[PDB]
Amino acid sequence: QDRWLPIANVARIMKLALPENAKIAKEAKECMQECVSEFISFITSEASEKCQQEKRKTVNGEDILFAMTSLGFENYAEALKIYLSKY
Amino acid sequence: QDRWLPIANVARIMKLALPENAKIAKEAKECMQECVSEFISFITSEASEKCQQEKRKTVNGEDILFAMTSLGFENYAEALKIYLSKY
Amino acid sequence: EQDRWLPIANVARIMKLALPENAKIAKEAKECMQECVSEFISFITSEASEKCQQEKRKTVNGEDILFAMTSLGFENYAEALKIYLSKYRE
Amino acid sequence: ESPLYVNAKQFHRILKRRVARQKLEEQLR
Amino acid sequence: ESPLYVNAKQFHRILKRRVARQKLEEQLRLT
Amino acid sequence: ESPLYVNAKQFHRILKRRVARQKLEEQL
Amino acid sequence: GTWANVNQGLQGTARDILTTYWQHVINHLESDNHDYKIHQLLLARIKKVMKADPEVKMISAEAPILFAKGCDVFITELTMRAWIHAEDNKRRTLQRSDIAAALSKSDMFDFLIDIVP
Amino acid sequence: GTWANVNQGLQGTARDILTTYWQHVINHLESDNHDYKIHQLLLARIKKVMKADPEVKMISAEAPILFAKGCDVFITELTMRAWIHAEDNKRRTLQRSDIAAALSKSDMFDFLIDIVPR
Amino acid sequence: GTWANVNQGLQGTARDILTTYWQHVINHLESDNHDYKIHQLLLARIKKVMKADPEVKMISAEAPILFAKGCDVFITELTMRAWIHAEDNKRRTLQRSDIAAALSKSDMFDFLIDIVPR
DNA sequence: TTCATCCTACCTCTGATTGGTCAAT
DNA sequence: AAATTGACCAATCAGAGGTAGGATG
Ligand SMILES: [Cl-]
Ligand SMILES: [Cl-]
């Protein structure tokens, strides 16, 4: 289970994404769960390799933003940079 | 409060009375608690008045049974009679 | 036997007092702390014990515990309890 | 909804429990 | 259905995640 | 995970407690 | 006569089942090896219900022990009577209206008309 | 170029709405008063996904917080991209095939080719 | 120096709170009217822990009294050190892993390497 | 084709159960 | 001090009701 984000939180965000009338198939929720969980694992694997090769043990915010840029999530990296500078 | 038996014990007896897959509404548990608590208070009050009228201070097993018989719980009196004589 | 551990109710009471009044403690946290503080005793006592055998003495005393505490890098514990031990004897 | 005659073995004890429950509630408050 | 070239920024990390994912399955079925 | 050098004041007493702990566990 | 209350107001298989439940209760009470130390917390609380009545003074140890057994039977038989009404509405969750419906089948339950109006 | 992914693969009304949704996200992150509040159970679950990778040793407290927010945006965008295919088929129920269809429109999602075969 | 262990591995507010805890412990041990009469069962159990070592022969009445006091300080400072990790993870329940995390911040706790594997 | 109205099957979301710690005994 | 059990909180799961999507004419 530790591979996947919990499904209830995923289903809540999807419901807010959709019009009031909309239903979501159980299959659709499970799929979205696997997708967002790979999104984390994917970016984190990139960030983690760069840390190991620069002899740092701590994966920090800049490592996640740098990895998003590398992997072609530039819109995510720039939008979230603003969020991180306030932290 | 002193008026009511604790609800966990009541809920446990109810769960054992129902099929293994049955659910019990909170309101059903709370209702059964009030019922069984009055069952005690009702029989006890009849036993307690007979004691006062016959100037006795202690209420004993045979008074509970005599009160159950007079109040129309005859099955409860006759079944528990057998139990009292073993005690 | 299993006399290797302090009783857990005393450990959990001291822990409860260390935390904000509305904190909770997991059973496994209490058990962990119980083993930690019991090795704290065994670890120090073993050092104090060896020195006693090497100086041919039979009794382990208060000075021996404090000396073992400084030896093992529990200097703050030895210095704070020094004050306490002096008062015990006067 | 509300019947005049109930169990003949219980009626008198029901009336008394109504009185005893009212007292408890007024002594509670 | 399955293409030879994918997003050039992502392709290598994809090959590595295929390996890292295989090794998670090796342990789960073992244990 | 398992370091070569630990606290210099404690190392030798740690080694000795590992021996003493196995022997206590030998009774069972 | 003495067992009229066992199946009063029940028809069909419910009748046989409540009857068989009482037979099972009676055989149990007829057994020779009773353990008369039910939890001190439950017997303490039974006694506190009895002592809420100002008229009550002293209570025999015998009395709470009779009510412990009696209250187990009462809850069991009323729950089983109430389940009938949940099964008829094709429900798996027992509701308050199932206890109310059950009470209305037998005048043994008339003492509860203010508790469950 | 760094906003290319916002509408890559979308046509007509869908382009405007996903663009507007991204303007909404950026306005939100630019605001001055952030909680940075994560539920304990979500925080422990993000760390556990990251930690499943043996190469990951220690994680900063700010990393799970970035992912909390990024995963909100990822779910919403993809759900909104998926819904288009549900509307096209005049359906009220979003299905797995709507997500599959959404993934195929942008190469940003190539990383998911083994998670959703299509 | 002597008090290095009070603060070893702690940062920010935790550092002042553990130092203030130790100043409170020292004020208490410096007070002139101690009661050395601690419960028969706790001192029976302390002696039994000491006596579990075959190398120990006879134990002074002083030794168990030093440990009763020392163990209260040990438990308190480690629980307070472990609570920091509970707060960092937005939790109000202390877990075993909060204790493990606290042991890793100071080499004073190296003696517990086999009691709490980490 | 476009309705009218069933039925069947799935999803929703309230509310019941579960898991685990405190408090009382 | 240790074990047992009720109460309670937060997190999860299940079922009772609601809506979709299909069948028929
Ligand atoms: Cl019995
Ligand atoms: Cl925020």
Residue numbers in the entry:
A (entry chain H), B (entry chain E): 44 to 130
C (entry chain B): 43 to 132
D (entry chain D): 231 to 259
E (entry chain G): 231 to 261
F (entry chain A): 231 to 258
G (entry chain F): 47 to 163
H (entry chain I), I (entry chain C): 47 to 164
Give the exact sentences the study uses for this entry.
The core version of the CBC is a heterotrimer of the subunits HapB, HapC, and HapE that binds the CCAAT box, a promoter element present in about 30% of all eukaryotic genes. Depending on the target gene and other transcriptional regulators, the CBC hereby either activates or inhibits gene expression. Recently, a pan-azole–resistant clinical Aspergillus fumigatus isolate was identified to carry the mutation P88L in subunit HapE of the CCAAT-binding complex (CBC), a conserved eukaryotic transcription factor.
We, therefore, switched organisms and created the HapEP88L-mutant A. nidulans CBC. Despite reduced affinity (116 versus 0.83 nM for wt), we obtained a SEC-stable complex for this variant with the 23-bp-long cycA promoter fragment and elucidated its X-ray structure at 2.3 Å resolution. In contrast to the wt CBC that binds the DNA fragment in a 1:1 stochiometry, three CBCP88L complexes associate with one DNA double strand encoding a single CCAAT-binding motif. Substitution of Pro88 by Leu leads to N-terminal elongation of helix α1 by approximately a half turn. Superposition of the wt CBC–cycA complex with the mutant CBCP88L protein indicates that the mutation-induced extension of helix α1 clashes with the bent conformation of the DNA observed for the wt CBC. Because of the altered bending angle of the DNA, the sequence-specific HapB subunit fails to find the CCAAT motif, resulting in its structural disorder and the random positioning of CBC complexes on the DNA via electrostatic interactions with the sugar–phosphate backbone.
